Design a protein around this ligand. Sequence first.
Ligand SMILES: *[C@@H]1O[C@H](CO)[C@@H](O[C@@H]2O[C@H](CO)[C@@H](O)[C@H](O)[C@H]2NC(C)=O)[C@H](O)[C@H]1NC(C)=O
Ligand SMILES: *[C@@H]1O[C@H](CO)[C@@H](O[C@@H]2O[C@H](CO)[C@@H](O)[C@H](O)[C@H]2NC(C)=O)[C@H](O)[C@H]1NC(C)=O
Lengths: 181, 181, 11
Amino acid sequence: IVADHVASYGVNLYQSYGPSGQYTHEFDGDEQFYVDLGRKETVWSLPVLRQFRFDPQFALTNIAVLKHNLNSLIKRSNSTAATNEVPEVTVFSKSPVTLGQPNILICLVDNIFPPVVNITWLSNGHSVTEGVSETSFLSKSDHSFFKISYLTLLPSAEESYDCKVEHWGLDKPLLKHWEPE
Amino acid sequence: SPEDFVYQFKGMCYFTNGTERVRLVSRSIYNREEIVRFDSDVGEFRAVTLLGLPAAEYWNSQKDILERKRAAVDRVCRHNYQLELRTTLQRRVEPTVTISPSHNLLVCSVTDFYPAQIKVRWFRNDQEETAGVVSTPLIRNGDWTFQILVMLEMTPQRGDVYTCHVEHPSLQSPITVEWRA
Amino acid sequence: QPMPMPELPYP
Ligand SMILES: *[C@@H]1O[C@H](CO)[C@@H](O[C@@H]2O[C@H](CO)[C@@H](O)[C@H](O)[C@H]2NC(C)=O)[C@H](O)[C@H]1NC(C)=O
Ligand SMILES: *[C@@H]1O[C@H](CO)[C@@H](O[C@@H]2O[C@H](CO)[C@@H](O)[C@H](O)[C@H]2NC(C)=O)[C@H](O)[C@H]1NC(C)=O
């Protein structure tokens, strides 16, 4: 469909593995908010949107409808499971690299299905957790997902990084390297 | 390899020319197969695959549900659009424009801008360069900013002045960055 | 307030 703008009010996800769910709204491909289903609270992704209120119970009730519908379709499909796809991983920086100026590494994990993935960061072969964050699963029109992880850093001549991606569509974890040059 | 059964529900709105043309499409998806749909251009639930037939028939038989669905293009899509008009559609992040050699190849990095609409052109003296220019796709950072990198292959002669011209809705006047050897 | 769309229960 062709449109000046496209929104999802919202993207609802529920899956048997876990199990787990996700509730978000999207506008022109970006995440407006998610509902933390465990804490039952709306978490706005854009500071200008904090002026609004969204009842988290709407999300919890909707996910329960998805959970019920899924159980029905598992039976009717004769337990037709999801097919694992091969995700595509790319690492790049938010801004041009200048040594000694703060930056952010971005790891895009695209063509994700099913939406179950572990994205971590490595430096000199050891895991890095400080300064790491990630988006929710963001929707795609072919009904796969993408997800983006971030690592804040101070670029330095001696220090390189890997984005590490575990997904059932991969024989072994995928490492995408980034060098400051 | 764990098995997974996945269900998605997407309540989508498509906008063209403000709210003059608005189309609502809600999609129920089993794994990656959309099985049943409500398209406001159609006005009733329609099965997309055989697995969605029982839901479509049950949902179409409920006259109150159909009435609410047929009004949702206004109660949801056009309603939420008024909120986008004073939040997301007013978001302006001015691009940062940098030129760095990579040196017969110049990289014009245009980073951290919102919204997506942008135009980047390379000039040699006062002549626009089209051959020898190659650009990345528009890159979505996931944090409500974009970037794009526009490269120019050159054979630079003495006195030549190369400029990267960037126009964007956030800019009162276009940004021009010069590079000289 | 921002309006969401409900999913409906399968028969
Ligand atoms: C991400 O990491 C978690 C934790 O290591 C993995 O969870 C394991 O999943 C297997 C298969 O379902 C279970 O048998 C294990 O008990 C789980 N471990 C733990 C500690 O819970 C998960 O599989 C990983 N995801 C991917 C896509 O590789
Ligand atoms: C975009 O939509 C606007 C409405 O917001 C259209 O402008 C209207 O056009 C009708 C004719 O059908 C006039 O009677 C109105 O007075 C117009 N309103 C305004 C505010 O100008 C416009 O034609 C549409 N443009 C496109 C390209 O579809």
